[PDB]
Amino acid sequence: FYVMTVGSKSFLVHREWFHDLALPWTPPSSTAWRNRELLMEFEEAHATKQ
Amino acid sequence: SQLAEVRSYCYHASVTDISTVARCPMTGEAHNEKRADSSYVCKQGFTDRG
Amino acid sequence: SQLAEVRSYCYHASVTDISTVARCPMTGEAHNEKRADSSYVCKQGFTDRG
Amino acid sequence: FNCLGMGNRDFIEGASGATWVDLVLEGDSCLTIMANDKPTLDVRMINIEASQLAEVRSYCYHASVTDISTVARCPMTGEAHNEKRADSSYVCKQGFTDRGWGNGCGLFGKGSIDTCAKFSCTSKAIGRTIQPENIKYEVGIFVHGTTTSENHGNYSAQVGASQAAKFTVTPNAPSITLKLGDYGEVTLDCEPRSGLNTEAFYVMTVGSKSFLVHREWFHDLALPWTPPSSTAWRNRELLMEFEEAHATKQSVVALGSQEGGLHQALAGAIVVEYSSSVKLTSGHLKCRLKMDKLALKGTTYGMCTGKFSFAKNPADTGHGTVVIELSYSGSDGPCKIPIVSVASLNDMTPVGRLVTVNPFVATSSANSKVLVEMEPPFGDSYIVVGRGDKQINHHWHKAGSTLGKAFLTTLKGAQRLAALGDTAWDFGSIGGVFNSIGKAVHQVFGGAFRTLFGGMSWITQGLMGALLLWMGVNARDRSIALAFLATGGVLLFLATNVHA
Amino acid sequence: SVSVQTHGESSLVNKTETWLDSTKATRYLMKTENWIIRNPGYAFLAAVLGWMLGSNNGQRVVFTILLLLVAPAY
Amino acid sequence: SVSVQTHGESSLVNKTETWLDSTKATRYLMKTENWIIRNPGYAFLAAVLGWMLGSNNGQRVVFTILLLLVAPAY
Amino acid sequence: DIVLTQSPASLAVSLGQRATISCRASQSVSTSYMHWYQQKPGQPPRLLIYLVSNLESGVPSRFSGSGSGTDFTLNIHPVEAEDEATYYCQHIRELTRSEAGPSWLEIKRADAAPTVSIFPPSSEQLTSGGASVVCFLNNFYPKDINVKWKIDGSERQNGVLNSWTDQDSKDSTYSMSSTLTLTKDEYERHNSYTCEATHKTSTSPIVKSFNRNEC
């Protein structure tokens, strides 16, 4: 398992379930993330307005 | 004693700088110049035109 | 008379500026700073370590 | 306001026989009426407006723990009482601490403690209840005269020509009479209160945005909620938790922001914006279009004597018709624009019908653009503008031949039957007998059956239908369709309607 | 998503008060019971399917009580 | 709770882009498939129960494909 | 990715008065994950507050603070002479881990004027070919001060070497030493040498002058 930090507190989670979490995640170093489109959405397109 | 950093997860996000480049039908793909930087979240789509 | 441009296809390519950022096992993902620009073609991987 | 370039454009085939018609409309869809002596009409909803909204209650999704206090007591003392149980702001809970002789007590195995933590709401959602009279409907109505690519998509421009109008129907004034000017007057009698169900649902505000939720599901939400006025809440212990009790130490921890869970709790909710009046996207309204005063003038106008031109090139509207824009260079105007839709050039007999009836030149000014739409027949046709040498034509072909169109009426007709409830038969307009009993048979069938087991979500009613199709396999003669009744249609259809 | 596929249960050592324990019993039943109360008309014809096939008596309920639990949240 | 018992689906009028539509197809399957991949050893003995009883062939799969969907999230 | 800055960068306050540091973190919702370091110049720091609520072992109970997300605070109600140091902070959550532009504690006292003494170069340095005119500014508070080398009434910024100490241990004032370096030939071609010292205490610069023709 791993140790997951949620907010200020940290908690224990299984590491195979840790990677199976569906939510934008982060590489160790700095920048480029994955699945960051999940916390955002879209709408209908009226002219240039979306 | 020592714990390595496996990865991180961004649970809370905010939208900044909404940009949508409109194009005509039959033009195929639409390309916004923001697809170069990974900080910008880009998605295809369409706008029904009259 | 008039023909619109639908898209293009690059059949012939060349490799420029090979960059591989090595990391230790158990570190999870490896992140190279070149993933920001879309001109750089990045791929994950591993190196068996002694 | 008009049907130009709308996402869903549906038409109306005039049988005449009456000057009044009962039609249902929507925000996205735009109805188009074509009748004799009556020009081509556009009827659509802009949005659904509501004036005054009362505050039903609120919900605190995000909380934080403040001032953890736990009063320790000895075993056999029974209940533990902390002085914080007086104020409702403090969240108190009973409990115990297993005691030895080492910690605080002279007995073993048991204990009692009262753990109180002041409740602090970081973020809270707010709901709103809809009053029937407060609901407004902005219904764009338009009649097709001489138009351009500008004025036709323009409202105030066609108001100067009196060819477009807007208005607000409310339960206080469901009937509105508006004049089209040169083409006469039309009377629109709507049913604002009965268009939607005002008390069927609420308007829930999650964060900055607001959203629609069923009001019976609104109260069934499990999350700390709020009375309208100010202070004392209910179930606020749900966003906080407890732990083991070591001596006097127990940590009340608060759940994070449930805003995402609220957005997760929202699935079929419609995104709704607002400023000083809420604008709902998909409309449902029952209106009565009275065309009695609407008529055709201007048969005094003979054909135009001079060259035409294309202001824009022809294309297909995707709804089955072909629109063109014509810049008339002749100075003989005002004149009735010659034009037709024909099968072959050697055959001058018109076949296709003009969507915009009686094309007309506005003024004598040369090079005046005019936008007129027509419906060509299926197969190879021709758009011919003008008579004699003066004519410039175009070839058109439409593959939508009535074979597939019969299903486009059939299949979408059942789609018109679905999701519209009992109002689905309002497309049976100027009805009675069949159309009357067709809704009446479905009335109680809409007040029972599908609505009784209604609430099924996607595959829930879809999967069991395939198991209810097996009920049609095992049966007896004359009992066959009995187990097959609700199976085919009304069940698997809506399951196939929404895939996805 | 974060709504489903919860960590529960760890089930490694762990004799303690976890993050959510007493609420773990209210996960499925109450939400599935709120579903069958949401759709009573289904529950009438639901248990009918059990008595339809197999004529084996007691295992016909094994269909129903299991199948009536299937429909909520699929 | 807010995690389950979603508003979906309205199914009243509503021809539009809702709050979550394309993600509604990924609700159950993917989360239940992530469960059966989580517990493959169950999936081996799961479908075995279907071939055990009734000897009626094709409806034995009706047990499995339904019962294999029961175990995820109960 | 995160920018940190600590303010006020220099705080003059008497011992016993509360000092609340206005701070912030650019990349937001750090949770708490913020610290405080006290460093005297030429030393390693010492961690003051961790968990934002909690001291380390050696640091006494006079240190405190609170905050979350962007803003954080270091609140010391009984500031002391032992608290005199350069306060640092540092962040966690994302990486790389970085600090803030620091903040100085200064114990407040009465504003003191500098004692200005401008010494002509020694006869030993002249024989060496150079001449360094030194100007000593001692026991002035606060640290805001300026030296201007006026040669024959004209200011020269060349060869000016300014060496000033930090806040003193005994009287808690500042001491400065200014040095004007010239060649002996350039020293003997210029007559009047003075260093005027302007300070917040004296509305006019303190002028200590000597000429080579004078003594």
Radius of gyration of chain E (CA): 17
Two tokens, residue B41: 């979240």
Task: Check: CB of residue D290 under 8 Å from CB of residue D19.
Answer: yes
For the purposes of burial, counting CB atoms within 10 Å of the CB of D210, is it exposed (0-12), middle (13-18) or buried (19 or more)?
Answer: buried
The residue written with tokens 């036709």 in the block is D152
**Contact criterion met (CB below 8 Å) for D24 and D286:** yes
For residue C34, the SS3 value is: helix
N-terminal to C-terminal alpha carbon distance within chain B:
66
- The CA distances from residue D229 to D55, D400, D423, in Å, are 9, 60, 39
As a whole number of angstroms, the distance between CA C37 and CA B35 comes to: 9
Output the CA torsion D32→D36→D37→D43 (10° steps): -10
Helix (H) or strand (E) holding D18: none
| Euclidean distance between CA atoms E52 and E60, whole angstroms | 8
Query: Distance (Å, rounded) from C-alpha F9 to C-alpha F27?
Result: 13
Identify all chain A residues contacting F34, using CB atoms and an 8 Å cutoff: 20
- Radius of gyration from C-alpha coordinates of chain D: 33
End-to-end CA distance of chain D: 30
Q: Locate A44 and state its tokens.
A: 């209908």
Contact residues on chain A for D256, CB-CB shorter than 8 A? 6-7
**F49 lies within 8 A of chain E by CB:** no
- Long-range CB pairs of F45-49, under 8 A, 24+ apart, other chains included: F46/F71
C-beta neighbour count of F71 within 10 angstroms: 14
Helix (H) or strand (E) holding D225: strand D225-226
Tell whether the torsion through CA atoms of D464, D469, D475 and D478 is positive or negative. Answer: positive
Residue of A1, A12, A25 best to disrupt the E interface, most CBs of E under 10 A: A12
Token couple for D469:
């199709």
Quote the DSSP letter at residue C40.
S
D456 vs E19, E20, E42: nearest CB: E42
Q: Buried (b) or exposed (e) across G107-133, using 16+ Cβ within 10 A?
A: beeeebbbebebebbeeebeeeebbbb
Are F67 and F29 a contacting pair, CB within 8 Å? no
**Following DSSP, what letter does each residue of E19-47 receive, concatenated?**
SSSGGGGGSSHHHHHHHHHH-HHHHHHHT
Who contacts D473 (Cβ-Cβ below 8 Å, separation ≥6)? none
Question: Residue C38: which residues within 8 A CB-CB, separation 6 or more?
Answer: B35, B36
- Give all domains of chain G, ordered by start, each with its CATH number: 6-108 (2.60.40.10), 109-212 (2.60.40.10)
G73 and G23 in contact (C-beta within 8 Å)? Answer: yes
With beta carbons under 8 A apart, name residues in chain D contacting A43: 271
Tell which residue, D59, D80, D65, has the closest CA to residue D118. D65
Interface of C with B (CB under 8 A): 4, 6-7, 26-29, 35-39
Q: Which residue has the tokens 């002479």?
A: G81
CA dihedral G134, G135, G136, G141 (to 10 degrees): -150
Q: What residues contact D423, with CB distance under 8 A and at least 6 apart? A: D24, D284, D286
Q: Which of D62, D59, D58, D57 has the alpha carbon at shortest distance from D240?
A: D62
Could you give the CA distance from residue G4 to residue G23 in angstroms, rounded to a whole number? 8
**Is the bond preceding residue B33 a cis peptide, omega within 30 degrees?**
no
Residue D285's DSSP bridge partners are: D25
Q: How far is CA D437 from CA A25, D425, D443, in A?
A: 58, 10, 9
CB distance G23 to G71 below 8 Å: yes
Task: Identify the helix (H) or strand (E) that includes residue D194.
Answer: helix D192-195
Residue A48: exposure state from Cβ atoms within 10 A (0-12, 13-18, ≥19): exposed
Residues in Cβ contact with D442 at an 8 Å cutoff, skipping those fewer than 6 apart = D422, D424, D425
Chain F's closest residue to A38, CA to CA, is: F23
Among E27, E59, E74, the residue with its CB nearest the CB of F28 is E74
- Pairing mode of beta strands D41-50, D29-34: antiparallel
D448 and D465 in contact (C-beta within 8 Å)? Answer: no
Cα–Cα distance measured from residue D403 to residue D153, given in angstroms and rounded to the nearest whole number? 33
User: Rounded to the nearest 5 degrees, what angle is found at the Cα of D282, between the Cα atoms of D279 and D285?
Assistant: 95
> Residues G202, G160: contact at Cβ < 8 Å?
no
Do D456 and E42 touch, CB atoms closer than 8 A?
yes
Work out whether strand A9-13 and strand A2-6 pair parallel, antiparallel, or are unpaired.
antiparallel
Coil, strand or helix at D171: coil
Length of chain B: 50
* Chain D interface with A: residues with Cβ < 8 Å: 253, 256, 271
Q: Chains that contact D by 3+ CB pairs under 8 Å? A: A, B, E, F
Which residue in this structure is represented by tokens 């150079």? G130
- How far apart are alpha carbons G35 and G72 in whole angstroms? 9
- Give which of A40, A9, A26 is closest to G27, Cα–Cα: A26
For E73, the token pair is 């949240």
Peptide bond connecting D334 to the previous residue in cis, omega within 30 degrees of 0: yes
Name, in order, each residue with C-beta under 8 angstroms of G120's C-beta and a sequence gap of 6 or more.
G133, G193, G210, G212
- CB-side neighbour CA atoms (13 Å) of C29: 20
DSSP letter for D337, please.
P
CA distance readout (Å), G178 to G121, G133, G159, G160, G166: 13, 8, 10, 7, 15
Query: Cβ G1–A30 below 8 Å, yes or no?
Result: yes
CB G137 within 8 A of CB G176: yes
Name the 3-class secondary structure at D24. Answer: strand
Please name the amino acid found at residue B8: S
Q: How many CB atoms lie within 10 A of CB C15?
A: 6
Do strands B8-9 and A25-26 pair parallel, antiparallel, or not at all (unpaired)?
antiparallel
CA dihedral of G90, G94, G95, G100, whole degrees rounded to 10: -30
Q: Find the residue in D nearest to A43 (Cα).
A: D271
Min distance D86 CA to chain B CA atoms (Å): 36
Residues 6+ apart with CB under 8 A from G105: G11, G13, G19, G79, G83, G84, G85, G86, G87
Token pair 């791993």 is at which residue?
A: A2
Residue G153: CA atoms inside 13 Å, Cβ hemisphere, count? Answer: 0
The rounded Cα E32 to chain-centroid distance in angstroms is 6
Contact call for G96 and A8, based on CB within 8 A: no
For residue E64, the 8-state DSSP code is: H
Cβ atoms D224, D239 nearer than 8 A = yes
Out of A6, A9, A43, closest to residue D271 by CB: A43
Q: Which of G163, G158, G112, G154 is nearest to G134 (CA)?
A: G163
Which tokens sit at D356?
């915009």
Report chain B residues touching chain C, CB-CB < 8 A.
4-7, 26-29, 35-39
Q: CA–CA distance from D131 to each of D178, D203, D345, G203 (Å)?
A: 27, 11, 60, 74
In a 13 Å sphere around the CA of D205, the CA atoms on its Cβ side amount to 17
Give the whole-angstrom CA distance, residue F31 versus residue E74: 11
Disruptive mutation site among G95, G97, G98 for chain A (greatest number of A CBs within 10 Å): G95
Q: Which amino acid is at D420?
A: L
User: How would you classify the pairing of strands G100-101 and G37-39?
Assistant: unpaired
Name residues whose C-beta falls within 8 Å of residue F54's C-beta, 6 or more positions apart in sequence.
Answer: E54, F60, F63
Rounded distance between C-alpha atoms, residue D120 and residue D91, angstroms: 10
- Selecting from B6, B7, B29 the residue whose C-beta is nearest the C-beta of C7 gives B29
The chain F residue lying nearest A17, using CA atoms, is F38
- What CA–CA distance (Å, rounded) separates D181 from D141? 14
Q: Could you tell me the sign of the dihedral formed by the alpha carbons of G130, G131, G137, G138, in that order?
A: positive
Checking chain B for breaks where C and the next N are over 2.5 Å apart, the residues before them are: none
Alpha-carbon dihedral sign for residues D465, D469, D475, D476? positive
3-state secondary structure of D243: coil
Closest chain C residue to the Cα of B7, Cα to Cα: C28
Question: Cβ neighbours of residue D340 under 8 Å, at least 6 residues apart?
Answer: D348, D350, D352, D384
Q: Using alpha carbons only, what angle is made at residue G72 by residues G69 and G73, rounded to the nearest 5 degrees?
A: 165
Pairing between β-strand D168-169 and β-strand D175-179 as defined by DSSP bridges: unpaired
- Residue whose entry in the numeric block shows the structure tokens 């009695």: D292
Q: How far is the C-alpha of D40 from the C-alpha of D12, rounded, in Å? A: 10
Give the relative orientation of helices E59-70 and F59-70 as an angle to the nearest 10 degrees. 50
For residue D381, what are its two tokens?
């046709």
G23 C-beta neighbours (distance < 10 Å), count: 22
Q: Do the chains contact at A6 and D256, CB–CB below 8 Å?
A: yes
Helix (H, G, I), strand (E, B) or coil at F41: helix
d(C-alpha G214, C-alpha G120), whole Å: 11
Structure tokens at D406: 């019969």
Question: Long-range contacts made by residues D90-95, C-beta under 8 angstroms, separation at least 24?
Answer: D90/D116, D90/D117, D90/D118, D90/D119, D91/D116, D91/D117, D91/D118, D91/D119, D91/D236, D91/D237, D91/D240, D91/D252, D92/D116, D92/D117, D93/D237, D93/D242, D95/D70, D95/D242, D95/D245, D95/D250
Our CA angle for D458, D464, D465, nearest 5°, is 90
Helix (H) or strand (E) holding D251: none
Instruction: Give the strand pairing for D175-179 and D185-190.
Output: antiparallel
CB-CB neighbors (< 8 A) of A12 in chain B = none
Residue G58's region, left for phi above 0, alpha for psi from -120 to 50, else beta, is alpha
Q: CA distances (Å), B19 to each of B43, B45, D208, in order?
A: 11, 13, 21
Give residue for tokens 């700095």: A30
Structure tokens at D151: 């004025």
D466-495: b (≥16 Cβ within 10 Å) or e: eebebbeeeeeeeeeeebeebbeebbbbbb
d(CA D149, CA F70): 58
Helices (H) and strands (E) in chain F, counts: 4, 0
Helix ranges (H only) for D316-433 are 402-417
Q: Partners for B (CB, 8 Å, 3+ pairs)?
A: A, C, D, G
CA atoms within a 13 Å half-sphere pointing along the CA-CB vector of D130 = 25
Residues with Cβ within 8 Å of residue C15, at least 6 apart in sequence: none
Q: Comparing C-alpha atoms, which of D81, D111, D109, D107 is closest to residue D93?
A: D81
Q: What is the DSSP string of chain G?
A: ---EEEE-SEEEE-TTS-EE-EEEESSS---S-B--EEE-TTS---B-EETTTEE-SSS-TT-B--B-SS-B--EESS--GGG-SEEE-BB-SSSS--BEE-EEEEE----B--EEEEEPPPHHHHHTTEEEEEEEEEEEBSS-EEEEEEETTEE--TTEEEEE--S-SSS--EEEEEEEEEEHHHHHT--EEEEEEEESS-SS-EEEEEETT--
Question: What value, to the nearest 5°, has the Cα angle with vertex D441 and ends D437 and D446?
Answer: 130
Q: How far is E49 from E54, CA to CA, in rounded Å?
A: 11
The 8-class DSSP code of residue F73 comes to: T
Integer Cα distance of D468 and D190 in angstroms? 41
Complete DSSP assignment for B1-45? -------EE---------------TTS-----GGGSSTTS-----
Tokens 């007129």 sit at which residue? Answer: D372
Q: Look at residues D55, D32, D139, D87 and name the one whose alpha carbon lies nearest to residue D374.
A: D32
Q: After which residues is chain A broken (C to N over 2.5 A)?
A: none
Tokens 């679905």, residue located: D418
Confirm if E10 and A12 have CB atoms less than 8 A apart: yes
